[PDB]
Design a protein around this ligand. Sequence first.
Ligand SMILES: Nc1ncnc2c1ncn2[C@@H]1O[C@H](COP(=O)(O)OP(=O)(O)O)[C@@H](O)[C@H]1O
Ligand SMILES: Nc1ncnc2c1ncn2[C@@H]1O[C@H](COP(=O)(O)OP(=O)(O)O)[C@@H](O)[C@H]1O
Ligand SMILES: Nc1ncnc2c1ncn2[C@@H]1O[C@H](COP(=O)(O)OP(=O)(O)O)[C@@H](O)[C@H]1O
Ligand SMILES: Nc1ncnc2c1ncn2[C@@H]1O[C@H](COP(=O)(O)OP(=O)(O)O)[C@@H](O)[C@H]1O
Ligand SMILES: [Cl-]
Ligand SMILES: [Cl-]
Ligand SMILES: [Cl-]
Lengths: 403, 403, 400, 406
Amino acid sequence: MPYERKIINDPVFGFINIPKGLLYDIVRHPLLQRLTRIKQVGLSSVVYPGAQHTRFQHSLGAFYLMSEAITQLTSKGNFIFDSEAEAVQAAILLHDIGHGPFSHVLEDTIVQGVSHEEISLMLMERMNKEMNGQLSLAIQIFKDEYPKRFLHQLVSGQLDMDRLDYLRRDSFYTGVTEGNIGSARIIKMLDVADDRLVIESKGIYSIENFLTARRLMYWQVYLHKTSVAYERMLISTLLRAKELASQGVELFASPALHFFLYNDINHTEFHNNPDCLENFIQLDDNDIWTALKVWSNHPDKVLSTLSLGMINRNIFKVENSAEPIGEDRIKELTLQISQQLGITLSEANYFVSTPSIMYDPADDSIDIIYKDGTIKNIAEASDMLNISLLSKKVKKYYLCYQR
Amino acid sequence: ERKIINDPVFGFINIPKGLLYDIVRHPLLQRLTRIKQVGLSSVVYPGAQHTRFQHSLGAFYLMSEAITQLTSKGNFIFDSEAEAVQAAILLHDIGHGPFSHVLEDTIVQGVSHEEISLMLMERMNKEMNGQLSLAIQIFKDEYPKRFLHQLVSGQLDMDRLDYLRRDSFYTGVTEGNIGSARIIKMLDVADDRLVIESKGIYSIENFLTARRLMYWQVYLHKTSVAYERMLISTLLRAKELASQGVELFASPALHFFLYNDINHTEFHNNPDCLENFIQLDDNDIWTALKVWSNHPDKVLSTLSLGMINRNIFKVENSAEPIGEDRIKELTLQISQQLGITLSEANYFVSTPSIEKNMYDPADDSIDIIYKDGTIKNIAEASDMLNISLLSKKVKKYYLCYQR
Amino acid sequence: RKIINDPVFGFINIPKGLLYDIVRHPLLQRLTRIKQVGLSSVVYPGAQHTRFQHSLGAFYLMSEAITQLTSKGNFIFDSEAEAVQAAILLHDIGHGPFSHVLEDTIVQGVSHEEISLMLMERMNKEMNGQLSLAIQIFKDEYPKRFLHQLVSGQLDMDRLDYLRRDSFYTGVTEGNIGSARIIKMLDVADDRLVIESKGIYSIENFLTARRLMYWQVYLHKTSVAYERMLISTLLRAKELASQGVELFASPALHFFLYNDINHTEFHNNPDCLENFIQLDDNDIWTALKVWSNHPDKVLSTLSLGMINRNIFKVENSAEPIGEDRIKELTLQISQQLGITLSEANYFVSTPSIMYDPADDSIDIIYKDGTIKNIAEASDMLNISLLSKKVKKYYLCYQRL
Amino acid sequence: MPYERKIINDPVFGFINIPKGLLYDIVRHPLLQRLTRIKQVGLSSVVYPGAQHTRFQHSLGAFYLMSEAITQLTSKGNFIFDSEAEAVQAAILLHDIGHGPFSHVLEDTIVQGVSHEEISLMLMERMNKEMNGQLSLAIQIFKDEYPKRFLHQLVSGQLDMDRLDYLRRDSFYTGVTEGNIGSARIIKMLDVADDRLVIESKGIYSIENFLTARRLMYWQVYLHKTSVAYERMLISTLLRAKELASQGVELFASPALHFFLYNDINHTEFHNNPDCLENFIQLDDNDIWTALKVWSNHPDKVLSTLSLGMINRNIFKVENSAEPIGEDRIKELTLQISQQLGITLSEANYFVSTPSIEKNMYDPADDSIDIIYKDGTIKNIAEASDMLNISLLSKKVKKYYLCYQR
Ligand SMILES: Nc1ncnc2c1ncn2[C@@H]1O[C@H](COP(=O)(O)OP(=O)(O)O)[C@@H](O)[C@H]1O
Ligand SMILES: Nc1ncnc2c1ncn2[C@@H]1O[C@H](COP(=O)(O)OP(=O)(O)O)[C@@H](O)[C@H]1O
Ligand SMILES: Nc1ncnc2c1ncn2[C@@H]1O[C@H](COP(=O)(O)OP(=O)(O)O)[C@@H](O)[C@H]1O
Ligand SMILES: Nc1ncnc2c1ncn2[C@@H]1O[C@H](COP(=O)(O)OP(=O)(O)O)[C@@H](O)[C@H]1O
Ligand SMILES: [Cl-]
Ligand SMILES: [Cl-]
Ligand SMILES: [Cl-]
């Protein structure tokens, strides 16, 4: 019998219908509300000022597409029980809950060796306790431990609701191009064969488009050189903060940020000391920006110069090469920066970065189902271009340094 | 003054009073109001109702923007040259009759729209006392400032920049949308040839992929291929019956081509051909089909009724040629099912094929200009796109037949 | 489910069975050859959308409306949902080409609503009574009365589609009337459609936009003039036909030109409906195209004006047009064209004007269950004043 | 081309071109970059999670439109010298520069009696000194003290680029497609007659939609009652934090925020003491949210309950009435909440709010737009419009809100 719903506005996909009960209670939970304070692609806003969308919007967006995908799969003779529908919807609402601000930066700096996927499971278990086991089936699906295995695939896999949301929403908000991966269309082509997700043959060119757009998104947005440079500055800022902290230097920070600056939190500490998760939960983009804003006037020349560059958008110069960067160049620039900033040679390392560089080539193996029940790999189904070659490794070296 | 015409795709289209408005209000351009841009596509995409008139105006709007942009980047264009390219683009598709390619294959054989466009341009030029002479010279690529012609016809022409966008908009195939106005903003000239500024590489990457998507998703949609084969049969049967002296309902203009054998020689040499061709639009074709659907001939009427009632030939495709034994089997089944001769059943079985190289420098070879004046082909400028990725021979063998 | 593309609302799912059988029926396929606003494309070239798209779009909106109403605990049986879905697919099926023009000229005294019912009954026979509930709802003869109101009334899916689609395709403004949102705010109170208070401004917008669509598009002076020209053309063709003059026409069109079909003849002689069914825009345009070379000066001049877009000049007044002005122009035209003074009446036209003000009386339901008329609920502007008669007087005449 | 131009992507309007030189220098200036950290409609995101756009975006967008407006006006023959073009472009880049985070809320709480308009001017003059007087003409046009007066009208007025951006952008980001306007289209119908802006009669339809869209966005978005309630909560929280601070209680705060919580800044003090501007410049939304985040665990029951409500989006219940709220209801609620939360009756005042609005829906300051015809005739839109007349639009609205802890 039809359920009552709350309605949220989403410019990308329209009206998001949220059933009252568990699902709406997830949306209103403090753990999902904190995602209104974490940008989806916060390192991209420096290139693409419109990229202000939140991880909250992504999670609702992915939910929307999940709802639609349930309806479409049932319509095609794939039975899904109401509890499975509910479970897969709660999974998708929660899938990204373990992201902190600039999550990958944190994993490389002050919250080392713990991944957002691990934190998402902890936070789901925590919430399941609070909701007295109502998320158990969601978690079981999330962990791919449920016998109906296409349901997990909707949460995590080549055709997951997560990437069908973010690839579209990130493009929509950056304004990078005016093109459109067909997220709502892709979902209407979805079916199950042998307990795995396939796409109907009428959706073939949509999948080639999808697969191509995905690679272009990486080059145009995610691996854009200005955003890589910006990321390297943030990594250096926080590693310098932790070095100063360890020396007992005083740094402005909210209590939750202070926890990770003045303690050495690593994988084992994080899982064993419950204070870590409690403090992690209290971190969002505000904690990071507030630090950078205050640090920009800190006496330390390295921390202040980095921090001021972040807030005032004085971005490192970036060069890219097809071959590694020569030790000669690095030494040269480090010296010149040492001199220009009046810092030691070792301090000048913070101002020179040489990061390397796509995703699992198997993501490109989508199976297409024909009206006569036959199945082909998209690479054979395809007419537009050579899908096999979309995954040829492109080696791209970056040189980032103070300008 | 200037006249303003609304266009949902691009907004206000501004048409200067004088020669350009005179072109727009001319009977030869007004008639394109009654010829669809993609008439065979509405059978799949009911939204695809846009006319060749809209496309002409649309390409004219884009041309006007291109002139402004090119002049703002320091490319000298005289007012007479501007006017001439504007006129050329208004007139570029003027020689299309209803279902133009179908007519070239059936009852107006061996004459292309390109030849007819030129005849009509010359005809209008006489009426307008030589005012289109420069436009015609640029149209033909016989003018020494060569980038102007490139805006009419070439990899970046205003024609495809209109149609890819317009066709996408009206079909609702948003995966083929292009940033037509964005591409124009990145347009420039280097060595009397059109180039795109490096900041527009992403726009061009989408442009090249969208063109491929629209090719297979819309223009070569198999339902549209089937429909076209049916129209080709219907008109051929009509010409066969007419040559036997059978009476067919037809407008005088259509009657002319049904009851005379018009070929290339005849078309150029007998001036009645062009006079009657000018009077053909989609209404002449659909009225014939509507009335012929009650004709006593079984072949003609069954084809005609299939057209108007949208009972379309079943269509199969194969990567290899259709077997002669399959064809004979179907032809025999259909001859029996409809009670017609084996020879007559030929009209109800068709085996068109496409052999296409997906990489074609005529559409793909676009040069990118950098801030330092260096120029790279898009295949080198693109991190993702490259000649190998795009180079792909596709062979598709269709089998279309009465169900 | 079959899936069809609609740029205005997205993908339209059509259940296999009855509903898809309606979509693919010859009677609905013919609506692909009749424009929703065919006299508008002369001003707005993008306005090429068909009655077929409108029917599918209204259907899309119906499907969403059902879901939403049931979500709020208004019970709809599956057969009722299907009924209302079928009704809205079929609601405009009785439109011929330029349907109001035909009702004023060569298919006089028969309304599209009447013809829609006949065609529904015809299809119901073919379909073994599967449309009986749909027809009963269409007639407002079913006791669950909010269902009919979805098909026809102040908040019907008909106008929620066409107000949006007509704006979309004309490109008249970049505004958006907001049709899918309005549906999400629908509820039933005392067996009638209401809107939740969260949608109040959506509704003021909707009511305002509707008026602006009337003035900007539906009553645009160039379109009025164009209508008058087509009216004259067809009346002249009927007159010539009645004198025994030969006119090019498809058999279907010939039937209405060479016989005098009125209300009683239409309902009593079954050849009428049969021929009407076979009329679409192509029959009218092919006639105009051929008539543009007809020996008759009145017919050919009118027809050539249509096909070449040489539109009557239009003036507007607040007061009726003076008889002396009319006589003056008629004389000038008779002289300029070399036709009799009576014949010159074809080239001078003075039509007058909005819709039922009760269409503006939508009820708003608040969370406490209280109900107010939108005019009291409203804060944006004076809803009551939207229906203040605007008296417009048109003078359309052949130019030169 | 003689100078390099920087191109910034905008989803709303596309490529935004910034000439190298003064204009790009303004865009890259730390005072404009800080607008990347201040939301355009920060109180709306609570209802419209898509409303994440920044004052920086709005600035760049209004500038984009201005660029097109200059081009369009000069194409209809109007004289805009390159220095006036530049000036009007710099004026619009800078027009909202004086907004701090939740600027109106600050004016009502801890930076009282100073409008963003005043602060914008102060920062414009500050930047002018930095740039050796290059912004002088721009300031002059901003102030409406330039003799070519239609230029100022492009910055501020019934057809200014400010509203032509924000109505479109706000509509785009909220997802209220009903408030969309054809900004570019309006600009294409723009001209000057008698040193004032006019709209060509072919644009009447756009101007009709423009005026209705403005009124819809006013009620649907800007005065959405959830947004009104959120704003009241934040006003309470900051007032309470200033109360506790004046009593010497210690509250977490960035230096810049601390300066306003631990000093009483008023109009006199803001203009006369230069530390006020220096610290204001350093405030953005991060300062406010980091305070609320840490205060949500503060010992004070009032502050912490308010703060946790903000961050967890447990918003005050909101009622509206056409008539004033009865003092009997107010006391009843204040008493209930005082008991429910275990705070003094005086402290429960923080949890009950009765703000109100009186609004004339017809304001010629927004609505009086002149339409020019082909024959040079001019009619006010009210006469030019078949539908939209003064009587349709003239409407006094009185709303009384009742916001309180739920
Ligand atoms: N102030 C700014 N704010 C946001 N984005 C900018 C700004 N300036 C430039 N951009 C965008 O970010 C990209 C990188 O800028 P940057 O690295 O500073 O210049 P460059 O074009 O020399 O690499 C540019 O391509 C431009 O689109
Ligand atoms: N009656 C119709 N009118 C317009 N479009 C239709 C109709 N029926 C189906 N379509 C669309 O056209 C496409 C081709 O339809 P068709 O070739 O008849 O069926 P099939 O899906 O078996 O190929 C379908 O994918 C569908 O989206
Ligand atoms: N050739 C054309 N095709 C389509 N629309 C046109 C054409 N010429 C003008 N229009 C549009 O139709 C409207 C009516 O044009 P018309 O009545 O001929 O001229 P006027 O603007 O003098 O009334 C105009 O406002 C214009 O936007
Ligand atoms: N968690 C949320 N985040 C963002 N927006 C929400 C959330 N919950 C509801 N909304 C939206 O904000 C509006 C106001 O919500 P709220 O005032 O809490 O509930 P009510 O609908 O009872 O007024 C709703 O109409 C809804 O669309
Ligand atoms: Cl189960
Ligand atoms: Cl693009
Ligand atoms: Cl208020």
